[PDB]
Design brief:
The structure is a homodimer. Chain A is α+β, with helices and mostly antiparallel strands. Chain A has 2 domains: about 160 residues, Roll (Thiol Ester Dehydrase, Chain A); about 90 residues, Hotdog Thioesterase (Thiol Ester Dehydrase, Chain A). Chain A has 5 helices and 12 strands. In chain A, strands 1, 2, 3, 4, 5, 6, 7, 8, 9, 10, 11 and 12 form a 12-stranded antiparallel beta sheet that branches. In chain A, helix 1 runs antiparallel to helix 4. Chains A and B meet through helix 1 and helix 4 of A and helix 1 and helix 4 of B. The complex binds N-(2-chloropyridin-3-yl)butanamide (2 copies). The site of one N-(2-chloropyridin-3-yl)butanamide has 14 residues of chain B, from helix 1 and strand 5. Chain B: It is found in: Plastid, Chloroplast.
Chain lengths: ~260, ~260
């Protein structure tokens, strides 16, 4: 992994591992999401963060994901090398974008792209805050100033509003609980676990006869180590689904999302 | 990674990733067990298996894990490079052993060791059989002929008999279910998921104040993708030892038993 020539993006190569692949012997979307998260962490490290800056660490501020958007054209095979490039960009005072492009190291062909929206909130109160000008100056020097979008197109899937699934759901997987392996180093549920939980309510028949092309996920509230999630899915159509994760008991929303699947 | 000079072992280097680490910012024992499985697979591929030989594929036979044994002296940190060497050895008609040594790439010091016992099974019927000569000969040419043991010691903990936990358990975690991420490419539950499930019944207190030194797991039955598992733990002991049982949440059919040993941080 390294910063590129101009110091405004970061690249890393990954060999797909035996346990990272599903039934077609290609990388799961959960493997793809872990590697986007790993290269994001390697980019923050390379520029002095650890993703808090100077003013942020003082007043107990953190970056948190509001939304993840991933489009995969081809899933890398077991043994294949994927190259991931990542960069960040200010969205004014509303927050921050991290973008990714995935390439076949062998062909140099683009095999996927992802984008994400981050907002600042207080670690303790979990209250959102429109970013301060003193915080931007610190992190703007690691970002391209001209716009660089993994998803440039005006009216594109990555920015569409997602509605709330209405009961009854067509499909459901209930009583989902995280184990220690699902937690990060600060004992919060890792963002990638929610992607698995969303996909858990897709019927095995869809997964067997289709490949996932697009996943958009809104993050509304964290699932704690001792919470229990219900995963709900209704067909909206290629196959398209509407998704909802909510706490098993009171039915408090934690995530909503959509997926688009192509017949193999 | 690559086969060594003599072609009787395999070495691979792994950089520890952000999401592979726990509260201590060092690799979890599940991350370690995944890397052991990855380097085992890279060793099989290197010598032309797929971990079946020619005869095995004809007779619908497979290697399956009967027992896993991991001892960790030091968990590598986020960003550390760890080097793993692995080899196999015949235990005659009984089955085969795969051993591992983990090293700090920087110091070259031994940070861990592991050993596993594999037996030959019919894929379909699940009925064990002793290793035949025709099969023995095919894989014998990829194995050191003189003994090479990760755990040479005389009365060593990798070989101890493991008893059945008696109800009531001191601790339990109920209604454990695998999701798709827990499954391998043939849609069987990954052996490493059982390790996580065993550890789920250890109180957070022990994990916060101790480090896992040793884990021994017997594999008795597979958890199907529509099974539900109960994890049971009783303290058997500055070192804490536990006895472990995984069973199907309904009829209480045993899937696994094990022991762990923890030392205070
Ligand atoms: C939360 C998204 C921002 C982030 O991960 N921080 C970062 C790291 C490296 C360079 N530039 C930036 Cl903005
Ligand atoms: C589970 C049996 C051990 C195994 O994976 N087989 C193997 C692979 C490479 C070299 N030699 C051998 Cl015996």
């Amino acid at each position: 992994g390294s910063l590129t020539e101009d110091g405004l993006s970061y690249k890393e190569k990954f060999v797909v591992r035996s346990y990272e692949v599903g039934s077609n012997k290609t990388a799961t979307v959960e493997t793809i999401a872990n590697l986007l998260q790993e290269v994001g962490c390697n980019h923050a490290q390379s520029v002095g963060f650890s993703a808090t800056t100077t003013t942020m660490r003082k007043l107990h501020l953190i970056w948190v994901t509001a939304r993840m958007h991933i489009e995969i054209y081809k899933y890398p095979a077991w043994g294949d090398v994927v190259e991931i490039e990542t960069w960040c960009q200010s969205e004014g005072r509303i927050g921050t974008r991290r973008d990714w492009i995935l390439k076949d190291s062998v062909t140099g062909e683009v095999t996927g792209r992802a984008t994400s929206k981050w907002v600042m909130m207080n670690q303790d109160t979990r209250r959102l805050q429109k970013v301060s000008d003193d915080v931007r100056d610190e992190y703007l020097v690691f970002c391209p100033q001209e716009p660089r979008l993994a998803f440039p197109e005006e009216n594109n899937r990555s920015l569409k509003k997602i509605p709330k699934l209405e009961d009854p759901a067509q499909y459901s997987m209930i009583g989902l609980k995280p184990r220690r392996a699902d937690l990060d180093m600060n004992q919060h549920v890792n963002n990638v676990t929610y992607i698995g939980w969303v996909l858990e309510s897709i019927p095995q028949e869809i997964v067997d006869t289709h490949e996932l092309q697009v996943i958009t996920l809104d993050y509304r509230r964290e699932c704690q180590q001792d919470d229990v999630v219900d995963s709900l899915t209704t067909t909206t159509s290629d196959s398209q689904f509407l998704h909802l994760l909510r706490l098993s008991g009171d039915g408090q929303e934690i995530n909503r999302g959509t997926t688009l699947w192509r017949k193999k």
